[PDB]
Amino acid sequence: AAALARLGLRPVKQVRVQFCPFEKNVESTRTFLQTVSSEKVRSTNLNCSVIADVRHDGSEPCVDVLFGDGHRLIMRGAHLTALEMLTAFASHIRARDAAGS
Amino acid sequence: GSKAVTRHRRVMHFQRQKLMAVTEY
């Protein structure tokens, strides 16, 4: 949360996390949500929304990130760690922010 | 020569230096 708060969710428009709790491959996705849903990150951009939609359809978890520019980032967390998902998430923040300005 | 107690570590006789080397833990 500390590393992601220094950067800030400035370009981000919406973030959506969907996962199936009973499934045994959602630890990564639930850890990603624990930081992004922190008061440090959420404070940087109040306009930026953060949504969590729980499901029990036996489907895989995904993280969908909507940006202001219109570009989208999707990370399927079944075989991705929170750090990998967070790292990729940060890299896109830096690139999209520079493109806008 | 030098006294038995010195501010500096005094060099041993070679026979003693060998003794200390054989009698090492």
Partner: protein, 222 residues
């Protein structure tokens, strides 16, 4: 559930009325007139006094022989009295005040012409002696910091210890002597004068057993 543990209680401990270290005078009350020989064997070998704890639990251990003058006592006193808590700590001297006179000739004079005049006084110290003893409602980790700071400024090899570390230090050395796989030891050879080795040794080496060389102490020697 991080497992918590009981803590020691020092409620049963008492603090004296003057916990701080008393002042040490440069010279004794009455000045001495009879000049003394160098007598260097007062810092040579192990100590036979002040090797055990009396009141406190932490101390500064001497790992070598040397002489202490007034400048050393002031450094120990100020550094300790400043860094210690008078309410929960107390300290005492385990060494007497400077009493051995040290003569010195005037600058520019040649050899001869008698003996010099008393310049200053010192306190002889042997290896294995306690210099300062501390205690009170405190652990060793608290005092160990500034006691080692003091120990590093002393003219000999010193180290802060406790009733436990000192005991462990001694038991580990006994373990080394017992499990030593070397069949040849300094004691066995010297006492039996094997190889005529007593022609390069000293009579004191029969008792020091190779652990001492002048004023220096070697703890790794068995």
């Amino acid at each position: 559930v991080k497992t918590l543990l009981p803590v020691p209680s020092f409620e049963d401990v008492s603090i004296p009325e003057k916990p701080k270290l008393r002042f040490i005078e440069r010279a004794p009350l009455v000045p001495k007139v009879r000049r003394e020989p160098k007598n260097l064997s007062d810092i040579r070998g192990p100590s036979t006094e002040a090797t055990e704890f009396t009141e406190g639990n932490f101390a500064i251990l001497a790992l070598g022989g040397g002489y202490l003058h007034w400048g050393h006592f002031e450094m120990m006193r100020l550094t300790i009295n400043r860094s210690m808590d008078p309410k929960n700590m107390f300290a005492i001297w385990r060494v007497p005040a400077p009493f051995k006179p040290i003569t010195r000739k005037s600058v520019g004079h040649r050899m001869g012409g008698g003996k010099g005049a008393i310049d200053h006084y010192v306190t002889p110290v042997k290896a294995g002696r306690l210099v300062v003893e501390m205690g009170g409602r405190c652990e060793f980790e608290e005092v160990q910091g500034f006691l080692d700071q003091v120990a590093h400024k002393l003219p000999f090899a010193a180290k802060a210890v406790s009733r436990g570390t000192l005991e462990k230090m001694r038991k580990d050395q006994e373990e080394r002597e017992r499990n030593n796989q070397n069949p040849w030891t300094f004691e066995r050879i010297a006492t039996a004068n094997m190889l005529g080795i007593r022609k390069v040794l000293s009579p004191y080496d029969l008792t020091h057993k190779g652990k001492y060389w002048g004023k220096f102490y070697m703890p790794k020697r068995v």
